[PDB]
């Protein structure tokens, strides 16, 4: 009977809500009210990376904090050199509409994907010199929205068929299929130890998954609309989400509930790109109001505005040493901020 | 040391990017949309994952994307198609049950914040089945405004009244709120649809240039 299962499901939901209510002895803002604010952070556009023809959906910084791959809807994956402004590589993609891109931790490969339902892995360290298709991962049903490497060997991809997938690049098939989301999974983010990963979807829910187990360990609710972006806190025990309801939301894995909401009455537009700083004190979020905002992650105060774009900011990434922030947008220009 | 070779590699990359820029700006992107029973497949196979078609009209390359590999939820990947010149919108004008679904889809496309610039080329297919349904299912049951509607096809004018009522409903949604709508009446066997796409895209890029050089 579906009615008794519905009753058991709402009883379990009430039990989880009561456990989170009894666990909420205080808030992060009440604890951090005694510490000093971070002031005003005036990040300037130190470099502008131009050369894309269509709008950008994804970037990913390299682990050397110098090179970044960027994905644009002309079918272009450009790997840049942010120190010297030059383009290291320019990959012409098979499908024009690319929605995600990744840069490997070793740096040898990049990934892309989008409406072609396929994660394309490109080798940047070929013996000939030119960049070819290393692997063509097919098996997803919906559009590929986020993919991030674990190493040279495996990659987890989030897709629009309410599933995520851990793929083996060597054999080209899904080792693990993560199922349980209700809406289109729009972004994932790996933990620093790469043991677990969170994924935000269009069901106003973020699911914390184990990579080896494949079962959804934790489920986080509290958002009001489609979560478009997600990023772990640098310690790996918390994460922030951005969504279409103009609120960013920092949750904790151990507390298993909401910690803090990042919102303003002057903001009515959704968040497309979420990342933290090196310390995690600054949460930088790109918005649909043509700009980005640097929220205080412990005080919920908008400490800065990154207003160098005249179109939608869609991707935003922070270097692994925290040296720079690159806010790619729909102007076909990446902008390096510092 | 390695800065000079990086500079020559960057120069070669911007040369290839300039060639791709001329190729990209020469072609006009089109987003084909429709229902499952709509005749968008006959539209995309008329002048012939994503079903992509190149077709050259008057030495102008139009490249059209039929996205059928996705699910029924479309609020996120439709934002991919904002840089296209137009949204081709195929409507079953003969299927009154899902005509309101097509009207709601066109309203959501028209009022979407990232699709506010895009014009919609409206193709009302199955005009022959619409004619054989009108002369032989009443649209007044699914649309009470047809009881008070007047005409603003050659054998009988009730077909004209029905097709212009559907066109007027779509144009009422279009004009209820930078971008125009280009409704057309066409069948499955019609070779003029590429020419209609060419003329409507010519009007779209002409109005875009009229806004660009500040005449509008």
């Amino acid at each position, epitope marked *: 009977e579906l009615d008794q299962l*519905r009753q058991e499901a709402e009883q379990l*939901k009430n039990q989880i809500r009561d456990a989170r209510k009894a666990c909420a002895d205080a808030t992060l803002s009440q604890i951090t009210n005694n510490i000093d604010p971070v002031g005003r952070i005036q990040m300037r556009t130190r470099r502008t990376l131009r050369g894309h023809l269509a709008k950008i959906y994804a970037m990913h910084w390299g682990t050397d904090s110098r090179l970044l791959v960027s994905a644009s809807q002309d079918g272009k994956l450009i790997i840049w050199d942010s120190y010297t402004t030059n383009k290291v590589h320019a990959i012409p993609l098979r499908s024009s509409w690319v929605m995600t891109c990744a840069y490997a931790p070793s740096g040898n490969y990049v990934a892309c994907g989008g409406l072609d339902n396929i994660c394309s892995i490109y080798n940047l360290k070929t013996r000939e010199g030119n960049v070819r298709v290393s692997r063509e991962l097919a098996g997803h049903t919906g559009y590929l929205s986020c993919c991030r490497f674990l190493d040279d060997n495996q990659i987890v991809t989030s897709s629009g068929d*309410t599933t995520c997938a851990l793929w083996d690049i060597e054999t080209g098939q899904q080792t693990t299929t993560f199922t349980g989301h*209700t*809406g289109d999974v729009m972004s994932l983010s790996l933990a620093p130890d790469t043991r677990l990963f969170v994924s935000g979807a*269009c*069901d*106003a*829910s973020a699911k914390l998954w184990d990579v080896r187990e494949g079962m959804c360990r934790q489920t986080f*609710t*509290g*958002h*009001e*609309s*489609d979560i478009n972006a997600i990023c772990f806190f640098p310690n790996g025990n918390a994460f922030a989400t951005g969504s*279409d*309801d*103009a609120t960013c939301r920092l949750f904790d894995l151990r507390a298993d509930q909401e910690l803090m909401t990042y919102s303003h009455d002057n903001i*009515i537009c*959704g968040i497309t790109s979420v990342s933290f700083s090196k310390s995690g004190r600054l949460l930088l979020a790109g918005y649909d109001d043509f700009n980005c905002n640097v929220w205080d992650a412990l005080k919920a105060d908008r400490a800065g505005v990154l207003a160098g774009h005249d179109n939608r900011v869609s991707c935003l990434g922070v270097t692994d040493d925290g040296m720079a922030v690159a806010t790619g947008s729909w102007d076909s220009f990446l902008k390096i901020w510092n | 040391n390695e800065e000079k070779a990086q500079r020559e590699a960057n120069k070669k990359i911007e040369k290839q990017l300039q060639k791709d820029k001329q190729v990209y700006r020469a072609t006009h992107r089109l987003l084909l949309l429709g229902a499952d029973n709509s005749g968008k497949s006959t539209i995309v196979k008329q002048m012939r994952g994503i079903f992509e078609t190149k077709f050259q009209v008057d030495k102008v390359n139009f490249h059209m994307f039929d996205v059928g590999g996705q*699910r*029924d*939820e*479309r*609020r996120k990947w*439709i934002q991919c198609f904002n840089d296209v010149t137009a949204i081709i919108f195929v409507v079953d004008s003969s299927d009154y049950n899902r005509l*309101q*679904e097509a009207l*709601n889809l066109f*309203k*959501s*496309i*028209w*009022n*979407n*914040r990232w699709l506010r610039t895009i014009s919609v080329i409206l193709f009302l297919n199955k005009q022959d089945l619409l004619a054989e349904k009108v002369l032989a299912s009443k649209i007044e*049951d*699914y*649309f*009470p*405004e047809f009881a008070r509607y007047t005409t603003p096809p050659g054998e009988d004018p009730r077909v004209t009244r029905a097709k212009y009522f559907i066109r007027d409903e779509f144009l009422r949604i279009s004009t209820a*709120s930078r971008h125009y709508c280009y409704p057309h009446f066409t069948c499955a066997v019609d070779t003029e649809n590429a020419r209609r796409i060419f003329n409507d895209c010519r009007d779209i890029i002409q109005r875009m240039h009229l806004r660009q050089y500040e005449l509008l």
Partner: nanobody
Amino acid sequence: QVQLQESGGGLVQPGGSLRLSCAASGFTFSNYKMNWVRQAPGKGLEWVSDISQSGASISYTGSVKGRFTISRDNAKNTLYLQMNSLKPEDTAVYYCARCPAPFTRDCFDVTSTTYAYRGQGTQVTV
């Protein structure tokens, strides 16, 4: 959590009246354009009506115009659908949909088979 509980559905004679009340929790009602959709047995999801954020823009499907009305109340955070003169073709299960993004007058995916911001529905039968 975005939760939508519908109530008021049940057996009703043709030509009668029926009130559906949906209680909304987990989101602010005043920012979302709230829809009522339905699914007939052996049929797909059919959109019935929608009401805007302030209640000024109210629209219906053509088979329910003059018979159904849709209202919202932001004070007690709920949605109403009142049905007068029920045809026997109006038998369905009624879901209360929701606009996926706030402050937008476009409603994508409200009639999807696996839409997230939608209730479990109430069975309205003749």
